[PDB]
Swiss-Prot record:
The 2 chromodomains are involved in the binding to the histone H3 methyllysine at position 4 (H3K4me3). The CHD1 helical C-terminal domain (CHCT) binds DNA and nucleosomes. This is Chromo domain-containing protein 1. Coiled coil: none annotated. Component of the 1.8 MDa SAGA complex, which consists of at least of TRA1, CHD1, SPT7, TAF5, ADA3, SGF73, SPT20/ADA5, SPT8, TAF12, TAF6, HFI1/ADA1, UBP8, GCN5, ADA2, SPT3, SGF29, TAF10, TAF9, SGF11 and SUS1. TAF5, TAF6, TAF9, TAF19, TAF12 and ADA1 seem to be present in 2 copies. SAGA is built of 5 distinct domains with specialized functions. Domain I (containing TRA1) probably represents the activator interaction surface. It is found in: Nucleus. Belongs to the SNF2/RAD54 helicase family. The gene is CHD1. Present with 1620 molecules/cell in log phase SD medium.
Length: 77
DNA sequence: ATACGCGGCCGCCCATCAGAATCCCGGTGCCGAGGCCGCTCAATTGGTCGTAGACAGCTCTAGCACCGCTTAAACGCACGTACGCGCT
């Protein structure tokens, strides 16, 4: 569980309400979701850079829950 | 022959001496810690040897985790029958 949580913290239950130190909002949840790990900020910056030109980017992940997390992050954007 | 007197009897309030009954102080029997104790045989003391078992090294099973194709089993709801249970 530490090896799986060594890159993304959102893997348990008491983790989303701990970061949210205020009040349903939508931009604050995604803002607190991207800034929780460096791979999300750098992934969004490189994704925007690739979107400024036009390429087909793929994401290969091992954890099946992280795919759903990306399913909840990329759908809002 | 005819009229007066009275006599113990008695209800009356009023007086004296013993007996009954409550309170002020009590002895008695039962229970449970104490003490005494003493002959003594089981624990303690001082001591040796050796062996279980702690411990560190090691390797080598199996318990975990994880995933996805497949599907039997669980789910929830709709409808009515045949019991739970209440009464007499």
């Amino acid at each position: 569980e530490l090896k799986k949580a060594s890159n993304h913290p959102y893997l348990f239950d008491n983790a989303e309400e701990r970061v949210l130190q205020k009040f349903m909002t939508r931009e604050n949840v995604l803002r607190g979701l991207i800034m929780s790990s460096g791979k999300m900020v750098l992934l969004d910056q490189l994704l925007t850079r690739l979107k400024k030109d036009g390429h087909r980017v793929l994401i290969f992940s091992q954890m099946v829950r992280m795919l759903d997390i990306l399913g909840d992050y990329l759908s809002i954007k």
